[PDB]
Amino acid sequence: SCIQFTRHASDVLLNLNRLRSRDILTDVVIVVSREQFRAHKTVLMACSGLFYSIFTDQLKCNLSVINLDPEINPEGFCILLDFMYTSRLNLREGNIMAVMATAMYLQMEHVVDTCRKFIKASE
Amino acid sequence: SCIQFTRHASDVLLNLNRLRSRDILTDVVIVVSREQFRAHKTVLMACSGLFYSIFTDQLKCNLSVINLDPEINPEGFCILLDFMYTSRLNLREGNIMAVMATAMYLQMEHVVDTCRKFIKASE
């Protein structure tokens, strides 16, 4: 018999992004080919199968720095981190291959699906 | 020129609630008249003007335990904590006064608004 507030999840995510932009309560640095990205472990886990696995590991859950595979492109990661905190994906002809490869590595199934569809349309 | 994934914010919140239910990466205990509630500081801040003010304070941001005013009802808090993580509010004739009072104290404006409207309809 609950009532539901339609905009609540969006408003929560908007506030989480405001905290990220002001570097409030960020608890991890993600290192991508020397580029550094500060974030909240819980948001990373909520969006990515890879971060979910990393931060549920009894040893890795305590790390303040995570280094990604050197093949990962920092721009592709940046676009995906922005998507995690906003639901908006900056998908462009010039970045689609790097975004899809990063989303496959991060295990972000819905992003991989839209990249596959956008690539299929251009062939 | 971004594309947007409609269900992303809801899916993020659903995963944050799964982490809460499994007590994963919870970093604070909220004490309400001896009852204890584990949660994520970032989610509390994203939903409540009171928690936002508390955890942006340079001393309180580091506390692992927060004690609420003794007038706060633990059931009212529990219903509001559930709403924070789900967008669903269990509003009932028997709890509406305690829920509104707790939402006013926590500074959850949209919850206060619906409680005022539901109370006005019964008079």
Binding site: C2, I3, Q4, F5, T6 | -
Partner: peptide, 4 residues
């Protein structure tokens, strides 16, 4: 607010 809605009935979910």
């Amino acid at each position: 607010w809605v009935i979910p």
